[PDB]
RNA sequence: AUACAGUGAAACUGCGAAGGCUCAUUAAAUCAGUUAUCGUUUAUUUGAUAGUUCCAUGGUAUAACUGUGGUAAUUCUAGAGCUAAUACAUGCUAAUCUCGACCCUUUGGAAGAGAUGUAUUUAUUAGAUCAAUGUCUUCGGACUCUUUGAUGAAAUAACUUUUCGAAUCGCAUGGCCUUGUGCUGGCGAUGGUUCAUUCAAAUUUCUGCCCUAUCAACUUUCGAUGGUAGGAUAGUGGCCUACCAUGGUUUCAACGGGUAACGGGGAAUAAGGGUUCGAUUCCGGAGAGGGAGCCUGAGAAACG
């Protein structure tokens, strides 16, 4: 990154003759670490005293949350199909916040068969993924700042809310 | 489409390199009789 | 290492049931002692050996919680668990009173019971082990003294074990063997019952059906004993009615009325309790109250009384006819209760109720004139049904006027009790007049005219649908009455209802002036209606802030005139709240 | 060394018996204020 | 290089003493060197005021706090052991720090304006003041700008003064800084020039802010003693 | 009321109150509007000062351009030249503000490059 | 708008309007004596300087009061002394004749503009001037 | 003073330097005050603030130091041999908290059931009622609509390569008899996690003295104007990028034109007669040969 200041750009009035200043330390834009899938490597960068910041690049073990009961359990990552904060970001298959990524939902199968007995009330277009294995789930946590991959599962309303999109 | 495809002329790259006369070691007749088909 | 072992438990399910049962069998083979303790009891135990046993119970709890469906259960794990529980009971009840290792082995025993209840929490209708009576007799000989031990708000080791044993299909064999419901009913009929009493009541209500579907005659007599417990626990669900979980009482009372009719005094107690189920708490919902009144009717269809429960059911119908809730479903249940109450008053009630509730027909206006020409001497439920029809139930307007006039005719033909009935008529007409009704306010005005049977011309001209010369003559009648606490409060309430934020009509200044003139003519009656004037000024002061403050400001200014005349007459009072309301007016001044 | 092992344990249990009792001892004063309010 | 509040004579020096960090801000406090050395003159220079600070005569707010630039702000009771010196220092009418002399039963406490009440962590009610005494558990009816009375032996609130219309208020801030009389008017606006207004000898009127004013007692009975002329 | 991706929803239908003499309309308490930066449900909290004036343009959505003429006692040429000010402001589900419409706003948490004020009142 | 703490408007100025002709008339019509020195004690360098002016002996009295009051000698601070002592003694030998300064008579500064002709009690009403007299 | 014991070259250590010259000309954007940050960082100042334990003390690997040397040579070096820690990094640790079946009456709690943290990043929700001085008194009560008040519009399911439950010291032999350091046992400084304050910084609301329409258009030509999401942030923020809408300022002075902008703006002290001389902070930002990239710290795009 470069900057965080209004001095390089124009305001709501249209001004000119900028030529302002050598940029300070507190306009610090670090490089955009597009977090991907790999082996888990988090860079421990420093800022503002001992404010360590976890910059995750190759995180896997996503803690994704069963919605209707709120069961955040551990799984892997496959790939993001739709994220128009950059439509090339899904072409390159990175992993950022608020992305809709696919999960092999085998521990969710284990929890359902463990606290319900039988195997398969829950919606049908996610029951198809209960059968097959890959369910859609959206990342909540920030791997570029907190270094973690947490998320929430897609269950019904939010599922169709994304499936009608793409 | 503001910063998208500015068809301007830029200062440091206007003489960043220099061309070559013969270039391809083949002939252009070799191009024509190379991919006639 | 606790977090590391928690990770090992969260990943300790990936292997099959064979490997899970093998790891559980290796955990069982630490300190089982099945050669020594599978017969009756253990040979020896130590503090660190019980710590291996307490760790074994903790590992059983962690394994069951991890694999909380299958758990890889085995009879070797069951025998190791029974040996550990018996060794914990033996060490705790045979060691001397030093309490350190005794409390360690007691918190080992409560945790081992929690891990035992976890096995039935995980694998309940999966194993159903046929050699249950070994562990059942072991735990019974251990916890014989736990009679009223599980009676608390949080005691849920043996209470949860009893609920688990009672909420099964064929695991009630150890229940119906000797006793489960006896000790459960002892702690249930304990008088210091906290809110787990409702949990035990729901467990026995669900568990009476397994003891009834059981083909064994011992379980049939145990279901009879569960009905006998429902008859001998007639104070617990009464005293523990502190929440809205009265559907358990309504579900047991319907089950009891459908199941067992054992005494006429029991049916009278059930009917009086379901009468208290509608005369105890006003937060009972529609389906619960309907099923409670239907259960009272179902006990009355079997074994009702002829005078006492007759009057109790008549009071029940006199409340339910003023209710008539839930789109005539409560009205139909009230008609059934009036037809089952079995009296002459109840016979006239069922007649005059069925003749009006015939599924939205003109039989209501037929039956009003029918009972008017053939006026019944019961008259209580008749006045209830004819005052619900005089309220905001649109039809029977002239029939409501004739019903009020006929009640007045009966109250004049009495010439005491029917005058106290007219007191109830006036206390109903007061809440009718202080309302947003249109037809029922005019019916209450007609009832006021029939109670008034100058003043009669004033009432009929206030109910004259003219409102300009009518309101002028009302102001002149107030002037003649100036030159009555509840009576003038009712007249001013009817006037304020006819001029109650109806800002699509003129002369609202003269309407509020007539309200304040009647308020002044009541405030002149200082010996009686000073309290009513204070209440009317207080209600107008509340209306001065309640979402509309245009005419209520002039009402405040003109109700200040009673204070001005009183202070000119005084030339003792309560200055404190008057000054605080002056401060509130000064705060409204800074708006 | 062992006398330090005496004094460390004694100051630790005294620190517990001071702090963890004083905390509830003003939480009960909060309970008195809540009962009177 | 000085402020106005210190009553500092100009013929003193060149470098002015910056107070160190502490309870109060820099702009509303005087350090101990400008207190003892050149105001009531128990010293002649920085060397001997450091000497008596090492001797530890000062007992501000019941603790010693041996420091030269310790920022004694509003009504921190400076206590000196020799000749039982008890000093409550308040604002005069023209912006300076008038240091009134008080007695022991008055220096056994102080008062403090409450700034905010918090549900911080683990269900604990919470109160701060201008010296930042985070004391446990007041009543729920502590609004902003009320007045707690600190114990000064332990830290507990002993008495409480409610901020409402008809209370004796002290103004420290803006162009009203250091006035007393608290009643001509009340006017709470919605973001500025919001206050209770203060009288004069002819009962004149005044405008200030909420945070720039804080209560000291009642109409005739403050349990603080005040200096006179 | 969902024309964009990424789970358009409140962020914890939802409802709160900033207090301090500004009402919340009933659709803004319980309605289908999201209230992302409208301060009644919102994510922002209120502070600062409150300014009042009429508008000039409400052309783009979530842009309320207030005008604010105010008196100032000019001593230079001893006559009052009339003031004018501008401030962009995000929408609220209470009034489609047209030309005229003296409204007021409270200071909070810079939303775009130049907006710190969000509408709280219409009269 | 809002208030802002102004020590320049609650600071004792009292010197923009202190004129020596008015002060001399007040000393004449004062009817309480004036603390003059024993007559030789106020000449300065055996007569190499002046006598000393009234402002100079007032300032000397202030300096000795502050001196005894906090036990400190004042100094030979170079910038302030090269301004004030040399410029002060040169205008002293210019304008102070025999203990009396005549510098003011050679100086344009209007008396009635600043120091007389009251600004607060300006009495810009006939009624206000009538009530100010009566 | 036969394991230490004073002088002390040269080495590790704690800190020191804790704020100094020149050069090109910025019109409330440099500056000054002020509003706010439940929109954010914070060393130091100050006030507060920790409950998971199955069959008598933990490991080699480096210095300084010796010894062999190289090179013209440095605060340049390399082999070989030892050796210590508040250096590195694995690891030893009593039972007390509520509801109280029972009470024996005061020396009152024995049985049972429920307990027990922090630091990181994910979701549901705790966050309408009852008491009278009075409606009717039938001198009893269903009482809130009236007359006043009150609880009230962090509890849990998980990650993290997780920090800790004192290897600090001082003052006081003091109490006990578990038959010997058996328990020591009282207090205070330094620790130690977290919050708030203070300090400082960054943003941000507004206010503040040249003539200017021969500057009437500017802004989308470093996004112009806003919306949605992500990235980066100490966080707010078109600060940057994807997508979308065509906006926004202006004759109520946009935007643009220059200097006695080596002068000005209170930036401040004022002086007992100097009336724009007469006290100072700051001209604008940079630079450590020249641009570029990186690093350190509570604070930096470091005078080192």
Curated annotation (Swiss-Prot), chain C:
Gene name of the record: UTP20
Localization: Cytoplasm; Nucleus, Nucleolus
HEAT repeats: 269-307, 309-345, 433-464, 503-543, 545-572
Assembly, per entry: Interacts with snoRNA U3. Interacts with MPP10. Component of the ribosomal small subunit (SSU) processome composed of at least 40 protein subunits and snoRNA U3.
Residue ranges that the Swiss-Prot or TrEMBL entry lists as coiled coil: none
Annotated family: Belongs to the UTP20 family.
Known function: Involved in nucleolar processing of pre-18S ribosomal RNA and ribosome assembly.
Protein name: U3 small nucleolar RNA-associated protein 20
Swiss-Prot record, chain D:
Domain of life: Eukaryota
Subcellular location(s) per record: Cytoplasm; Nucleus, Nucleolus
Cross-link (Glycyl lysine isopeptide (Lys-Gly) (interchain with G-Cter in ubiquitin)): 32
Sequence similarity: Belongs to the eukaryotic ribosomal protein eS6 family.
Subunit-level organization: Component of the small ribosomal subunit (SSU). Mature yeast ribosomes consist of a small (40S) and a large (60S) subunit. The 40S small subunit contains 1 molecule of ribosomal RNA (18S rRNA) and 33 different proteins (encoded by 57 genes). The large 60S subunit contains 3 rRNA molecules (25S, 5.8S and 5S rRNA) and 46 different proteins (encoded by 81 genes). Interacts with snoRNA U3. uS11 interacts with MPP10. Component of the ribosomal small subunit (SSU) processome composed of at least 40 protein subunits and snoRNA U3.
Note: Present with 66000 molecules/cell in log phase SD medium. There are 2 genes for eS6 in yeast.
Primary role: Component of the ribosome, a large ribonucleoprotein complex responsible for the synthesis of proteins in the cell. The small ribosomal subunit (SSU) binds messenger RNAs (mRNAs) and translates the encoded message by selecting cognate aminoacyl-transfer RNA (tRNA) molecules. The large subunit (LSU) contains the ribosomal catalytic site termed the peptidyl transferase center (PTC), which catalyzes the formation of peptide bonds, thereby polymerizing the amino acids delivered by tRNAs into a polypeptide chain.
UniProtKB/Swiss-Prot annotation, chain E:
SMART domains in UniProt: S4
S4 RNA-binding domain span: 30-93
GO cellular component: 90S preribosome; cytoplasm; cytosol; cytosolic small ribosomal subunit
Subcellular location: Cytoplasm
Pfam families, alphabetized: 40S_S4_C (PF16121), KOW (PF00467), Ribosomal_S4e (PF00900), RS4NT (PF08071), S4 (PF01479)
GO MF term set: RNA binding; rRNA binding; structural constituent of ribosome
Cross-link (Glycyl lysine isopeptide (Lys-Gly) (interchain with G-Cter in ubiquitin)): 50, 122, 149, 156, 162, 167, 199, 221
Phosphoserine: residues carrying this PTM: 20
GO biological process, one term: translation
Keyword annotations from UniProtKB, A to Z: Cytoplasm, Isopeptide bond, Phosphoprotein, Ribonucleoprotein, Ribosomal protein, RNA-binding, rRNA-binding, Ubl conjugation
Sites of Phosphothreonine modification: 103
Segments crossing the lipid bilayer: none
Coiled coil feature spans: none
Similarity comment text for this entry: Belongs to the eukaryotic ribosomal protein eS4 family.
Physiological role: Component of the ribosome, a large ribonucleoprotein complex responsible for the synthesis of proteins in the cell. The small ribosomal subunit (SSU) binds messenger RNAs (mRNAs) and translates the encoded message by selecting cognate aminoacyl-transfer RNA (tRNA) molecules. The large subunit (LSU) contains the ribosomal catalytic site termed the peptidyl transferase center (PTC), which catalyzes the formation of peptide bonds, thereby polymerizing the amino acids delivered by tRNAs into a polypeptide chain.
Other facts: Present with 573 molecules/cell in log phase SD medium. There are 2 genes for eS4 in yeast.
PANTHER family, per the entry: 30S/40S RIBOSOMAL PROTEIN S4 (PTHR11581), SMALL RIBOSOMAL SUBUNIT PROTEIN ES4 (PTHR11581:SF0)
Protein name, per record: Small ribosomal subunit protein eS4A
UniProt gene name: RPS4A
UniProtKB/Swiss-Prot annotation, chain F:
Cellular compartment(s): Cytoplasm
Post-translational modification: N-terminally acetylated by acetyltransferase NatA.
GO molecular function, one term: structural constituent of ribosome
Superkingdom: Eukaryota
Keyword rRNA-binding on entry: yes
UniProt cross-references to InterPro entries, sorted A to Z: NA-bd_OB-fold, Ribosomal_uS17, Ribosomal_uS17_arc/euk, Ribosomal_uS17_CS, Ribosomal_uS17_N
Protein name per its UniProtKB record: Small ribosomal subunit protein uS17A
Source organism of this protein record: Saccharomyces cerevisiae (strain ATCC 204508 / S288c) (Baker's yeast)
